[PDB]
Amino acid sequence: EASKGLQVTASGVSVQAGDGISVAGTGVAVKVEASKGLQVTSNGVGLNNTAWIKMMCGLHNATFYVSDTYVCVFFCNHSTGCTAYVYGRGGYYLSMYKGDVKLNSVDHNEIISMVGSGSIAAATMVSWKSTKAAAGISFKYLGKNLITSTSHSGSVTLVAAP
Amino acid sequence: EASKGLQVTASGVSVQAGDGISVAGTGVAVKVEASKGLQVTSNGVGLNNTAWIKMMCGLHNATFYVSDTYVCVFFCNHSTGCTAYVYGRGGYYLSMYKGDVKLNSVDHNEIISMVGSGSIAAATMVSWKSTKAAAGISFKYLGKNLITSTSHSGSVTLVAAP
Amino acid sequence: KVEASKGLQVTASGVSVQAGDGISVAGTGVAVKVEASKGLQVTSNGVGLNNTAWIKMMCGLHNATFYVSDTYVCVFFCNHSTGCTAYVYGRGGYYLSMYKGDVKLNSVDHNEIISMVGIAAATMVSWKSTKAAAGISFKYLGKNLITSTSHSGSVTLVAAP
């Protein structure tokens, strides 16, 4: 007869799926939970290409984020507003100029930066004294780079942490 | 005949558990290794909520760390002492002032920071010339933020990297 | 003789477990199959992250297509415009020096650096007209805050995982 891991029903003998496992006519497979950073293909189980977002939200204890080709931002609500930790992507960094980082269309307050040559400075922590991060709120920013004078003007919306 | 994936005892045919798999009367499940960043629920396999710690320890090749609601820090022992890489959490950052970062009650020797307006500065690397990181000793710090002038005097105990 | 259903298959060798995505089936039993290049491992203790998964995470963070890593520094390179810009993290207590001749890609000196302030530690480094590619050289000087050690290193670029 059948015992551990197998079961008998009207359909005959089958493999009984437990936690992390799917059983179908396509075989016994690993089941990955959506939004927890893994994928599974015919090559096997692995990290997906956005697992790093969950990691950075954990790092900063952020509850909302944005990510596009040129910047990502991890927002923490505290006191009367929000402070976010910024990482450049694709070669870009985030401008620290007065009008260049808006949350819910509100201009930022204090920024902490890293420093380049001349007047170059890259925003790494950005705060809004009286504006909160929330899902669906707009984030409008200007990114810059060190090769050309091109400014990247992006408008995206906040997403809840995974 | 029962063949690959199955095993036979006097009690019948069962699924044989290989690496990463557990088999019980309740079925075939994924087995995750405790300290390696994954979890398994009825919803499937995923990263757990502290996998980011392993990632950051790997990033800096750190052997000890701390994490609380205000800050996390990753320590590398080298020469006669140690150097730590600092990340703010929850919107906070670490004061870089002379008496504001202690390891085992010893004041730091050197700090590298990111810079804000006026005297605002956030510690990003902190070094002690002759104090070693080890599990069970205290890290004391002053957390601050960009919205209010409130400070948090914190104390958190070092833990071995996972 | 047999009435087999989901998860099982029957061949001339008998009834066996049918392997789907993420599963391997052998005489040693049913095991998890990890995609070895995507940061996971499987041992007798179970499935977990391997010790280079952090590199995949950091390439994702910066959308980098090449990197270097040694025990003193890691760098994540993004090709854009006519050149390359890289994001820099210290390792082992070290940091990347920001002097003019201290950071070369394919033997070419950088054009711009962004840094943290101490002493200064480079966090972003850029080359106007040099591209990142696998196998080319990254030559740098690493420093630390305890001693005056000058680590002159040369390391080779690796394709992002």
Ligand SMILES: [N+]
């Ligand atoms: N990470």
